[PDB]
Amino acid sequence: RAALNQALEMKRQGKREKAQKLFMHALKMDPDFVDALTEFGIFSEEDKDIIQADYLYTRALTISPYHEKALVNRDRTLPLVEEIDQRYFSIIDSKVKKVMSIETYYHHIYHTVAIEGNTLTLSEIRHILETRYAVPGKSLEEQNEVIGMHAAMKYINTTLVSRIGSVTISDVLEIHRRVLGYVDPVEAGRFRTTQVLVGHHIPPHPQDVEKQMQEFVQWLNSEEAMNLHPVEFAALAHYKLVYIHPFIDGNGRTSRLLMNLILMQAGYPPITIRKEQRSDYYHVLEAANEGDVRPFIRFIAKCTETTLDTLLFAT
Amino acid sequence: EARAALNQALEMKRQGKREKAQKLFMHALKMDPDFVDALTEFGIFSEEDKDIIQADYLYTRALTISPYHEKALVNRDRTLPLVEEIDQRYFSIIDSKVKKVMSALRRVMEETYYHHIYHTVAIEGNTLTLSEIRHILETRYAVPGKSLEEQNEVIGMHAAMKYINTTLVSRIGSVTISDVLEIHRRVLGYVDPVEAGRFRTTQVLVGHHIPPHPQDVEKQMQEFVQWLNSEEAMNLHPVEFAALAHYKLVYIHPFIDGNGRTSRLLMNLILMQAGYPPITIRKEQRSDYYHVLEAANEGDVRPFIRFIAKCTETTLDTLLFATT
């Protein structure tokens, strides 16, 4: 409460830089502080950050749903953010049109394995897949992760992308069998049998994983999922597979391959979440676990625009 | 010219020159390997050097073409129970050496653990050395300038035999089809995870042998595992049973790859369950090993059973000498 009142004294005087640090400290000490969430929200609106403000008012109302200062702001920002979000998707739709009218295989294998902790370079990955000979001084596990990724995405492109019909549970297992096959052939293509902790997240118990996955693939084929914008649907699918955590390993890699399978089936190019975005990528997943999937959907959307901007660099 | 080479070999055998006779006998068989008269005459010739095992093989080979050939029949009826005894006597020699090896032994056995992975992969064409295999399994880091497939074959072998030792050797009950598939899932898994632990779906040629069609593989494997658990297989000497199992899995050829590796792991699973140590067929014996499998495909499994038996005696002699 003292750090909040200290942040308000700075905001009233002028010092913006010292206020944000004092605001962030009050939320680090108590992240469910209803009054600091609303005051940091109205503060962020002064820098034209309405997306952040709405996040803060929604976080406030999840704790105290009848908080007058959060409710009065939430109700104003809610339809406004919905529009801002729709407008960014229509910007992405026009860039997909321009791309569709108009080397990268190794770049995606590099970022999908590097974001998980793999120390192999792009030139080393190229040597592994072109020659099929080992890279000196690197672990065989890291080199097998690369081989399995190449197998998984060659299978998706050859058998799943252009195929007509619903996505099955067998397709998810077939992808995982190739992702984790060369590293762990015993556990590759089969569900997790033990309960674990993933950071600060407890996924479903192994006895609930099969049903949770039957429900997930039922959602993937539902009309509600089709009605969504491809970028939202691709992002929600990615998140839900990471939430279920159906395998002991290779969940992030399979969820990123399912995400691009959804995008490629919608006429979008395959998307890459770069190594450098590891921290940003885990921050939005944490926020989705805490209660709001929108920051994640926006992170995936920005990833699609950057990919389209790189492809739009040709006539 | 085949009949002339036979009569030329008889001329030297009658006079004396035995070195020139064997070369002339072998030439008549190279020209025509289904020559009934040269097989009997070469059989009687080999008995003069006290080689009754070779003689019976030759008369047996001659009667698989012409079953009523008087000179083959009269000698085969004579040598048939004779080799049966000689064969039984070599197994009892092996049984006494198994006893003696059951009376550093643990450190010496694990010292030749990388030694078994080297020979089972080297006999299949793998170019990795024993020191390279040791680096792969101890460090889990890659060996420079070698293919990842060859290095994954080594990792899969280590996984397969660590799984056999930890969950199958001391296990009670019948051997299942799932146990064969589980071994294969580890043998091939790191090389080919798509085909590892599943039967072959295409028809192929393996040297000069056509194995069962993929639509018959499941039924022939159900029949094989039924034989493995039968009382007839239990009544056999462990060395004969281990060798016959090895041969029958190689004959079926149930997987697209790793058939030789899995058949040699099942061979030792049978031996270890019988109180025998794990056996190794060395890289140098590649040609001898394929010669006895060819003879078993042609009609006689005995040379193969004798090859496996001499492999167990050499393994027991190494264990009896290392602890001396």
Side-chain angles (χ1 to χ4, degrees), chain A residues 2-5 7-8 10 14 16 19-20 23 25-27 29-38 40-58 60-67 69-70 72-96 99 101 104-125 127-137 139-163 165-247 249-274 276-277 279-289 291-301 303-315, chain B residues 1-6 9-10 12-13 16 18 21-22 25-29 31-40 42-101 103-104 108 110 112-137 139-161 163-230 232-282 284-297 299-309 311-319 321-322:
Chain A
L4 176 53
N5 292 349
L8 273 311
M10 232 101 304
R16 296 293 302 182
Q20 187 167 351
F23 270 121
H25 203 250
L27 281 316
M29 298 302 172
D30 180 31
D32 289 7
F33 188 6
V34 67
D35 299 84
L37 293 166
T38 54
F40 190 36
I42 65 101
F43 173 87
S44 78
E45 288 205 67
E46 296 155 14
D47 294 310
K48 314 190 192 181
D49 200 348
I50 202 267
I51 290 167
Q52 182 167 53
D54 180 74
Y55 172 86
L56 270 340
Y57 307 134
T58 311
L61 294 152
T62 43
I63 308 148
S64 182
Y66 309 106
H67 191 113
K69 202 162 112 189
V72 74
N73 286 268
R74 154 95 280 202
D75 296 2
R76 174 177 55 82
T77 57
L78 193 231
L80 174 63
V81 167
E82 282 183 355
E83 181 65 33
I84 288 154
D85 287 344
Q86 237 107 65
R87 289 188 179 192
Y88 191 55
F89 284 168
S90 81
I91 279 154
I92 290 158
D93 285 336
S94 51
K95 290 181 171 179
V96 174
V99 136
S101 82
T104 51
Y105 216 89
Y106 304 132
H107 183 256
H108 184 345
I109 297 164
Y110 169 70
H111 291 297
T112 199
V113 302
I115 203 163
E116 232 80 292
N118 199 294
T119 83
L120 290 162
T121 74
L122 192 271
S123 53
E124 288 176 336
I125 284 155
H127 182 262
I128 304 221
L129 301 173
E130 181 190 310
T131 73
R132 311 285 163 171
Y133 271 55
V135 161
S139 72
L140 288 160
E141 192 174 15
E142 281 179 322
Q143 299 188 62
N144 284 333
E145 283 174 9
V146 170
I147 287 165
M149 273 311 311
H150 178 81
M153 64 217 254
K154 276 287 169 90
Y155 167 81
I156 288 155
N157 298 340
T158 302
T159 314
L160 279 35
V161 172
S162 308
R163 200 190 70 192
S166 42
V167 161
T168 67
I169 205 140
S170 303
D171 298 308
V172 170
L173 294 183
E174 239 27 87
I175 291 158
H176 186 258
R177 182 59 187 183
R178 288 161 177 80
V179 164
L180 224 226
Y182 303 85
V183 166
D184 196 321
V186 172
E187 291 290 322
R190 94 194 202 184
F191 295 132
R192 179 169 48 86
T193 54
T194 61
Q195 181 60 288
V196 303
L197 185 88
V198 190
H200 285 294
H201 176 239
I202 296 173
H205 206 101
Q207 293 189 188
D208 302 321
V209 169
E210 209 193 50
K211 225 274 153 160
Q212 229 78 87
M213 289 277 12
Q214 284 174 46
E215 286 176 8
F216 173 64
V217 303
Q218 183 181 324
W219 170 71
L220 286 179
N221 300 311
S222 74
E223 59 268 60
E224 308 115 19
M226 268 313 105
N227 292 334
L228 294 172
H229 185 275
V231 168
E232 182 166 0
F233 175 42
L236 285 168
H238 181 158
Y239 177 67
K240 291 173 109 303
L241 201 267
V242 165
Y243 179 96
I244 295 156
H245 207 100
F247 310 116
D249 211 351
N251 297 284
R253 291 188 286 261
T254 316
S255 74
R256 282 187 303 270
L257 286 178
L258 176 59
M259 178 213 195
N260 292 325
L261 182 256
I262 300 258
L263 292 170
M264 288 181 45
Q265 282 173 332
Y268 281 70
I271 261 64
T272 99
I273 297 170
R274 293 166 145 278
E276 309 100 51
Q277 314 186 256
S279 56
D280 296 339
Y281 170 58
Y282 290 119
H283 178 272
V284 288
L285 288 166
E286 284 160 14
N289 297 333
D292 198 351
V293 298
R294 297 180 293 168
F296 191 75
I297 294 158
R298 295 193 200 95
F299 177 80
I300 296 317
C303 285
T304 84
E305 186 184 47
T306 52
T307 296
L308 292 156
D309 289 338
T310 302
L311 294 160
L312 287 167
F313 297 157
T315 189
Chain B
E1 197 244 79
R3 195 70 160 90
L6 176 53
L10 216 182
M12 306 330 296
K13 162 236 223 299
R18 308 197 90 266
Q22 188 166 352
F25 275 122
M26 286 280 238
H27 199 130
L29 264 288
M31 216 106 180
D32 181 35
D34 289 7
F35 189 8
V36 167
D37 300 83
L39 283 161
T40 40
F42 190 36
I44 295 158
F45 167 84
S46 78
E47 288 205 68
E48 296 155 15
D49 294 310
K50 314 191 191 182
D51 199 348
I52 298 135
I53 291 167
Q54 182 167 52
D56 190 76
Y57 173 84
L58 295 155
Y59 310 141
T60 297
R61 194 169 165 81
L63 293 153
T64 224
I65 339 187
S66 180
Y68 309 106
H69 183 213
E70 70 299 307
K71 201 162 112 189
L73 254 166
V74 74
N75 284 295
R76 210 277 224 83
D77 294 2
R78 216 203 75 239
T79 58
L80 198 170
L82 223 186
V83 301
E84 281 183 355
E85 182 65 25
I86 288 154
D87 287 344
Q88 237 107 66
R89 291 187 178 191
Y90 191 59
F91 285 168
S92 80
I93 279 154
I94 288 158
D95 285 336
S96 51
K97 290 181 171 179
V98 176
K99 243 181 170 62
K100 197 210 272 60
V101 168
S103 66
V108 167
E110 286 190 331
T112 78
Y113 172 85
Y114 298 139
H115 182 255
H116 183 345
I117 297 171
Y118 166 75
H119 291 296
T120 200
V121 306
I123 208 161
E124 230 77 85
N126 193 300
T127 211
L128 290 162
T129 74
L130 192 271
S131 54
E132 288 176 336
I133 284 155
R134 189 157 50 218
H135 182 261
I136 304 221
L137 298 172
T139 72
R140 311 285 163 170
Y141 271 56
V143 158
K146 253 76 189 284
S147 72
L148 288 161
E149 192 174 14
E150 281 179 322
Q151 299 188 61
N152 284 333
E153 283 174 8
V154 170
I155 287 166
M157 273 310 312
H158 178 81
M161 64 217 254
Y163 166 81
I164 288 154
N165 298 340
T166 302
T167 117
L168 300 180
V169 171
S170 309
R171 199 207 206 180
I172 328 106
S174 42
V175 161
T176 67
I177 205 140
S178 304
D179 301 322
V180 174
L181 294 183
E182 238 28 86
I183 291 157
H184 186 258
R185 205 210 266 209
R186 287 160 178 80
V187 164
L188 252 205
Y190 302 85
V191 166
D192 196 342
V194 171
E195 292 289 322
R198 95 194 202 184
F199 296 131
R200 153 174 142 266
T201 54
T202 61
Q203 181 60 287
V204 303
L205 186 84
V206 190
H208 285 294
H209 176 239
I210 295 175
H213 196 285
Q215 293 187 194
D216 303 321
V217 169
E218 209 193 50
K219 197 177 222 296
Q220 282 229 230
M221 289 278 11
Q222 284 174 46
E223 286 176 8
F224 173 64
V225 303
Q226 183 181 324
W227 170 71
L228 286 178
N229 300 311
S230 73
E232 308 116 48
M234 198 180 77
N235 292 334
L236 294 171
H237 185 275
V239 168
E240 183 166 359
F241 175 42
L244 285 168
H246 180 158
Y247 177 67
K248 291 173 109 303
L249 202 267
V250 165
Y251 179 96
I252 295 155
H253 196 266
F255 310 115
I256 268 142
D257 211 350
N259 301 278
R261 292 185 285 262
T262 316
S263 75
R264 288 186 296 275
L265 285 176
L266 173 57
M267 186 208 182
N268 292 325
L269 183 262
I270 299 257
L271 292 170
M272 289 185 306
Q273 282 173 331
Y276 281 70
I279 261 64
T280 99
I281 297 170
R282 293 167 144 277
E284 309 101 51
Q285 314 186 256
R286 192 183 197 283
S287 56
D288 296 339
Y289 170 58
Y290 290 119
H291 178 42
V292 288
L293 288 166
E294 284 159 14
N297 298 333
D300 198 350
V301 298
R302 297 180 294 168
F304 189 75
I305 294 159
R306 295 193 201 95
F307 177 81
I308 296 318
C311 278
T312 86
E313 187 183 47
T314 52
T315 296
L316 292 156
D317 289 338
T318 302
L319 294 160
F321 187 92

